[PDB]
Amino acid sequence: GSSGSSGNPDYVEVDRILEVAHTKDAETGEEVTHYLVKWCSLPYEESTWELEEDVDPAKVKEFESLQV
Residues 63 and 54: their CA atoms lie apart, in Å, by 16
Assign 3-class secondary structure to the chain: CCCCCCCCCCCCCCCEEEEEEEEECCCCCCEEEEEEEECCCCCHHHCCEEECCCCCHHHHHHHHHHCC
Q: Which secondary-structure segment (H or E) carries 32?
A: strand 31-38
Ordered by where they begin, the domains of the chain are: 1-68 (2.40.50.40)
Residues 59 and 26: their CA atoms lie apart, in Å, by 28
Question: How was this model experimentally determined?
Answer: NMR
